[PDB]
Amino acid sequence: EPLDESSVKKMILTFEKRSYKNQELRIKFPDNPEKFMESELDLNDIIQEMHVVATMPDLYHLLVELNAVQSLLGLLGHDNTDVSIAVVDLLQELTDIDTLHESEEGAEVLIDALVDGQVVALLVQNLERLDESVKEEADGVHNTLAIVENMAEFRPEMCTEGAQQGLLQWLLKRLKAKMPFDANKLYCSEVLAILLQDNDENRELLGELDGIDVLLQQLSVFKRHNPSTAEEQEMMENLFDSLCSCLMLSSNRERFLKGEGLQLMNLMLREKKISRSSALKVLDHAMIGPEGTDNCHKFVDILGLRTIFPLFMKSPRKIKKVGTTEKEHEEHVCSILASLLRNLRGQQRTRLLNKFTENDSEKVDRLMELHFKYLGAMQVADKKIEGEKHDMVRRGEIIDNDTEEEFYLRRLDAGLFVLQHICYIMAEICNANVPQIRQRVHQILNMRGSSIKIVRHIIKEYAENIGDGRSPEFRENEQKRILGLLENF
Amino acid sequence: EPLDESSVKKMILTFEKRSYKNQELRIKFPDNPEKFMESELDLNDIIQEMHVVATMPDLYHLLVELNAVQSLLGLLGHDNTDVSIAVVDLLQELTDIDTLHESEEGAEVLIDALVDGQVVALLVQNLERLDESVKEEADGVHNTLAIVENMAEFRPEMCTEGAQQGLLQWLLKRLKAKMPFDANKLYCSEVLAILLQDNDENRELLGELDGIDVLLQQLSVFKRHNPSTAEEQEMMENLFDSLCSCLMLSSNRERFLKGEGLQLMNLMLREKKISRSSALKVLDHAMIGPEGTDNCHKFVDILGLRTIFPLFMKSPRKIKKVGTTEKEHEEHVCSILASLLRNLRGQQRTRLLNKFTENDSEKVDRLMELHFKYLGAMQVADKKIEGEKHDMVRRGEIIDNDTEEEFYLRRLDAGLFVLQHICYIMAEICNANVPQIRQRVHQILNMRGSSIKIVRHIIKEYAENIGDGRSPEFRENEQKRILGLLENF
């Protein structure tokens, strides 16, 4: 049973004295013959006892102010890895626990100490030192990643400093490594993902290291045939999540292209199991917005229109065990088109438009089948929200920002994003000067019920939020464009 | 003191027991009443004795393996600044001696230790803490800068890591600070320059922090009137060196343009004393190569042609005490034209060309005056080398790369760069289909001696080296262009 108030103070003092004793025995007998280690074994056992400090109702403030933390890092830079491994292992169990809202006060103080101590850089050096997949050595790398999962997860803002430290560079090394592929390699890609998850610096950085090439090659192997294990799948799927996150950064767009990025995602689509679902999520990303413009053309030049529209006309599977389903697939296809439409110009733009005047514009037919599907949902979803708003008056609950988020998620759940893109697409086709499509769009909207103005309201919403947020100059410049379509339509 | 063997080892051991007794007296009576004061002093005096470790024939290996270094950094993070200031101060002396050769091994061991220890980040944190201009507090910042001078100076590869640490951001803060401006401010700008000196990452970074806006406004104060002191001048001149180093990075170009950077440099040139000389070195930098292209138009749109061509036709000062003179001044004007001619297109390109068909092309006249001037020098310079080459056979000294560097610099000294830019300019004008200029250029080259082919040999040299080097695509695409001129010429 643990119930100690500053008993841990004794624990620290003991740790510090023990470490102190080792340093001077490290100086006394250093030359190649060895008497020191016995000294080492006594001190690491003290760290192991200290391990249980995390379990204690965390008054971590002790650890930092009293310099436990600082000392612990030089341990990370010690000659025998055993004491490094002990420190990392120790360091995992003090960060897994912290997540509990309790002692946010030591966590904040403990976490702060670690980032100022440049924990990742030291950790990375240690990682560098570990080499040979000694089962302890292997476990040590794992626990090193663990730290970063838990640190990252706790204070995410901390990520960028870590990337600079060369963690990213080390991660990319491990993934390229030709060694067979068990859990440690997996866990890299969980961390890689996390590293990039919402962070544009780490995307600038990954890209600057030929890292998109890495990702593509690591995905390339699974191009014709699925993951042998459902553990390796979870990794492939991590490799995507990281590749997509990189695409969101504009400069990776070029680098995606130089790598035969489209060729691959295309191939994965043509050979339709099982990484199909995800490759369509990359494609969409690689074309979205202006920076996508080269890729939008590149896509068409490689018969990307043969690949995509079939998926536009009919979606599967109802249902696959690994879940992509429904609106998820549609949103991806429809976003892909909305990109092509807004971006394409010249010869490839004309090919796109034919595809909309084909089999008597069967694809306009489709678009409208989709339109009404999603509209009905959005309508019904909006009614619910209208009620809750009234209900919120009577209660006297006040609609604030966090109520409006809750409300947003319901509209997205109803396929608001795909509804916008299929209005946008609808509208982009009607300003092409092909009377066929414009007539049909309309012919269908009278038949029945729906106003063309119901659609305009949906564009005006897509447009307001629009690019959120690129430069206002680009925000207000694009928003002009989009509303321009609305006149001729 | 004259002879000391590993006494320094005794010195380290005492330092460590000194830090240790203190940490535990920092834990004993921690609370607001103070009796550790006796303790802090004794350990700090010991650190001070170590100050004399530098003097000793350096076996700095003792300091790193025995963990002197590591411990010192926590001292840097201690609650009384006086112990921090002692640590910086000691560090400065150690690094300064390092400026000397003898401990290549020692520096090599010690420096590594410091950069692994993320010293700048710790140092920056310490700098943040010291705010108040206690003379000791002030002195500490200075010696903190000195570390970076000596560190940077020795192992220059170190800089990018340092910038990341946020030293750059602090420097930018100090420069913008509205306090009057003695030595520490001057020092900052010596360090800034060093930080950017040959390092593209720190230029991406400086720019990323609205830093070019800083620089420009700090230069804007001296726009109409000279620096009061000759110490402040040194700082203005530092502010330029940094601004120019940033401009070598292409992204900074747009940012410079968002700053009224042409307007200001242009003004400084209209009000001809004393920062004129450097303002002309900035313009040149802001226009060189494709990335300049917007600035090249902007320049013409603000009458930059009225400013520059006068300086083209006649130059000063024969000579100013602060020397820009002669070839130095000329290279810059001609580099600026070479840029405008390559870059300008449309309406502004025509104005430029008129300026060359003006007073019977007095400006072509001029160009050829310059041509022959610099050719004479080069010719003479080349003969010398030719001899030196033959003499290097009879000796049996083998011209190698360092001999060819030495040779190169003699050509630059004779004004190779300005010769190239006037041969390019001369050639760029002759492919504009104005028979006047072409005829004259030729009429002057017959009269006398010089072959048009002598010039071609100079383009082929300017072209081979060309952009050295942006990307072998850009390099070979440009080198194509430049030699394209050579046909119709």
3-state secondary structure chain A: CCCCCCHHHHHHHHHHHHHHHHHHHHHHCCCCCCCCHHHHHHHHHHHHHHHHHCCCCCCCHHHHHCCHHHHHHHHHCCCCHHHHHHHHHHHHHHHHHHHCCCCHHHHHHHHHHHHHCCHHHHHHHHHHHCCCCCHHHHHHHHHHHHHHHHHHHHCHHHHHHHHHHHHHHHHHHHHHCCCCCCHHHHHHHHHHHHHHCCCHHHHHHHHHCCHHHHHHHHHHCCCCCCCCCHHHHHHHHHHHHHHHHHHCCHHHHHHHHHCCHHHHHHHHHHCCCCCHHHHHHHHHHHHCCHHHHHHHHHHHHCCHHHHHHHHHHCCCCCCCCCCCCHHHHHHHHHHHHHHHHHHCCCHHHHHHHHHCCCCCCHHHHHHHHHHHHHHHHHHHHHHHHHHHHHHHHHHCCCCCHHHHHHHHHHHHHCCHHHHHHHHHHHHHHHCCCCHHHHHHHHHHHHCCCCCHHHHHHHHHHHHHHCCCCCCHHHHHHHHHHHHHHHHHC
* Amino acid identity at A266: N
B contact residues 95-134, partner A, Cβ 8 Å cutoff: 116, 118, 121-122, 125
Selection from A201, A195, A204, A288 nearest residue A252 by Cα: A204
Q: Which two tokens stand for residue B76?
A: 């840097």
A74 contact residues in B (CB cutoff 8 A): 67, 70
3-class DSSP assignment, residue B212: helix
In angstroms, the CA A336 to CA A330 distance is 10
Judged by CB atoms closer than 8 Å, whether chains meet at A20 and B16 is answered as: yes
Q: Is B52 on the interface with A (CB under 8 A)?
A: no
C-beta of residue B109 within 8 angstroms of C-beta of residue B66 = no
What is the rounded CA–CA span in Å between residue A328 and residue A317? 12
Give residue B337's identity as a one-letter amino acid code: L
Rounded distance between C-alpha atoms, residue B295 and residue B302, angstroms? 11
Matching residue, tokens 């270094």: B69
Q: Which residues contact B26 (CB under 8 A, 6 or more apart)?
A: B36, B39
- Candidates B239, B242, B215; CA nearest to B227 is B239
Name the experimental technique.
Answer: X-ray
d(CA A170, CA A125): 10
Displacement of CA A161 from its chain's centroid (Å): 18
Residues 6+ apart with CB under 8 A from B60: B94, B103, B105, B106, B107, B109, B110
| Contact criterion met (CB below 8 Å) for B192 and B175 | yes
Is the separation of the CB atoms in B162 and B195 below 8 Å? yes
Specify burial of residue B211 (Cβ count, 10 A radius: 0-12, 13-18, 19+). buried
Phi (first) and psi of residue A311, to 5 degrees: -65, -30
Torsion of CA A395, A398, A399, A401, to 10 degrees: -140
d(CA B327, CA B417) in angstroms, rounded, equals 10
Q: Distance between alpha carbon B363 and the CA centroid of its chain, in Å? A: 33
- CB contact at 8 A, B123 and B170: no
Please tell me the distance in Å from A60's CA to the nearest CA on chain B: 15
Nearest residue to A9 (alpha-carbon basis) of A55, A95, A67, A90: A67
Beta carbons of B239 and B218 less than 8 angstroms apart:
yes
Closest CA to B290 of B101, B440, B466, B114: B466
CB contact under 8 A, A23 and B66: yes
Supply B147's token pair.
């570390």
Q: Are the beta carbons of A382 and A423 closer than 8 angstroms?
A: no
Resolution of the model in angstroms: 2.9
HSE-up (13 A, CA, CB side) for residue B255: 23
Question: What is the rounded CA–CA span in Å between residue B233 and residue B239?
Answer: 10
- B6 contacts chain A (CB < 8 A): no
| Structure token pair of residue A236 | 């492939």
Answer whether B230 touches A (CB < 8 Å).
Answer: no
Half-sphere exposure of B181 (CA within 13 A, CB side): 22
Domains and CATH numbers, chain B: 1-489 (1.25.10.10)
Largest separation between any pair of C-alpha atoms in chain A: 94
Distance CA(A364)–CA(A437), nearest Å, equals 7
Chain B CB contacts of A70 under 8 Å are 74, 77
Q: How far apart are CA A412 and CA B289, in angstroms?
A: 48
The residue among B229, B152, B122, B151 whose CA lies nearest residue B185 is B229
Specify the residue for token string 């901390």: A158
**What does the longest C-alpha to C-alpha distance in chain B come to?**
94
Q: CB-side exposure of B412: number of CA atoms within 13 Å?
A: 7
* Buried b or exposed e, range A59-94, using 16+ CB within 10 angstroms: bbebbbebbbbbbbbbbbbbeebbbbbbbbbbbbbb
The residue of B9, B12, B69, B70 whose CB has the most chain A CBs within 10 angstroms, and thus the best one to mutate to test that interface, is B70
Kindly give, in sequence order, each residue whose CB lies less than 8 Å from that of residue A470, ignoring residues fewer than 6 positions away. Answer: A478
Query: How close are the terminal C-alpha atoms of chain A, in Å?
Result: 74
The conformation of residue B290, written as its DSSP 8-state character, comes to: G
Chain A residues within an 8 Å CB radius of B20: 16, 20
Of A115, A116, A139, A113, give the one whose Cα is nearest residue A126.
Answer: A139
CB A356 within 8 A of CB A364: yes
Tell which phi-psi region holds residue B5, choosing left (phi > 0), alpha (psi between -120 and 50) or beta: beta
Neighbour tally for A235: CB within 10 Å? 22
Q: How far apart are CA B145 and CA B315, in angstroms?
A: 39
Q: Give the Cα separation of A119 and A99 in Å (integer).
A: 18
Check chain B for breaks (C–N over 2.5 Å) and list the residue before each, or none: none
Assess B23–A contact: CB distance below 8 Å, yes or no.
Answer: yes
Sole residue written with tokens 């194509």 = B480
